Amino acid sequence: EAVRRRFEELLREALAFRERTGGRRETLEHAVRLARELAEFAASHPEFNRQEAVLLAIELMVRAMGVTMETHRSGNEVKVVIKGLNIDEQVALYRAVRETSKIMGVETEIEVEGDTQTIVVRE
Amino acid sequence: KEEIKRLAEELKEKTKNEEIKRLAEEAAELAERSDDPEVLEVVKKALEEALKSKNEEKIELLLLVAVLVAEAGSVDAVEEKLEIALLALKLAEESKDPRIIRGALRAAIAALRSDDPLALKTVKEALERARASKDERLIRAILAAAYAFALLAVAGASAERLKEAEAIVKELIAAAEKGASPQELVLLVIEMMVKGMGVTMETHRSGNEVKVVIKGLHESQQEVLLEAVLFAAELMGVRVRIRFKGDTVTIVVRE
């Protein structure tokens, strides 16, 4: 459960950086570092599930950017539909999802179209 | 002479950006060391422009101008680099289309951040041809292909692969001036990234949409393709549907 307390701490740092800089690209490359900093903390916790760890990386970026998301869980597949992303946010979102999943070791099937990015997290 | 530092420090507190805060200090340090009357004139000028602008790209490209001039010591050594920004910055005052202003500035910043001679050469040539024509669909197409060819140089492609991509930039501008659809102008940017990164593709032309399948891209390379495809597709007004799965990138291009 200690992964949860690290999540809430990184989320304050993610929202606070949204107010200070207010830059359409400096907050993104920063928030991606925080999403990977969460994936590193949970990669060395063999108790924590690898899917849910990536989902908290996704939920960390969603609130850092100011968009909304919907979680669809179906057995061992978790589909996260994120809506309202521009180009910089989707390039920043895809980077954060690629590295946090590489660190946790889960396969991600990501589909980008328009302003919506759909992420599937298997294991 | 001084009087440069206080102009550069005022930008630091005004801005909220971190890169602006770092380059402004870096410009105040490098310019203080140089003693060229031509350099302290540019640096002083570039700073006064950034203080008036509310655009984090206009400020960043102007700062990166004063840095690359004072660090170079003289103005003749960065005469091309200067015109690359001077064209891109010119292309921002006149044009009112937000696609053009954001495109022309990011293309210069990416090229100036890279060091490849073939990259700066292609960008200056591309901005000369963009600033000449009064056609908006051509200017938006030259910038799409320029910013996509700059991201190949920032990612560090091989010398013989940027050459293949450069010929594609040349075919894209030529096809854009002859009046190619925004869909095919996007498919030329995908081919530039395919040829640029040393992979291959298949082209399905079924109905009004095009399917492209790309395999063999590392995750660091898929990030460059997505950024180049999304940005060029926005400059053309063209719907794209990119699906990732391992090393296989599938692109669906609609008009």
Numbering used by the authors:
A (entry chain B): 2 to 124
B (entry chain A): 3 to 257
From the study:
Several natural systems exhibit ‘facilitated dissociation’, in which an effector (E) can bind to a target–host (TH) complex to form an excited ternary complex (THE)20–26 from which the target dissociates quickly. We set out to design protein systems that undergo facilitated dissociation. We use a switchable target binder (host) and a flexible effector that can rapidly bind to and switch the target–host complex to induce a large steric clash with the target, forming a strained excited ternary complex. We show here that by explicitly considering excited intermediate states when designing coupled protein systems, a broad range of facilitated dissociation systems can be designed.
We used X-ray crystallography to structurally characterize multiple states of our designed systems. The unbound structures show an open hydrophobic cleft in the new designed state X poised to bind the effector, and the effector-bound structures show that binding the effector causes the two switch domains to register-shift into the designed state Y. Structures of the target–AS1 complex show that the target binds as designed (top), with some strain suggested by small variations among the structures (bottom). For (1), the target dissociates 20-fold faster from AS1 than from an unhindered binder fusion, probably because of minor strain in the target–AS1 complex.
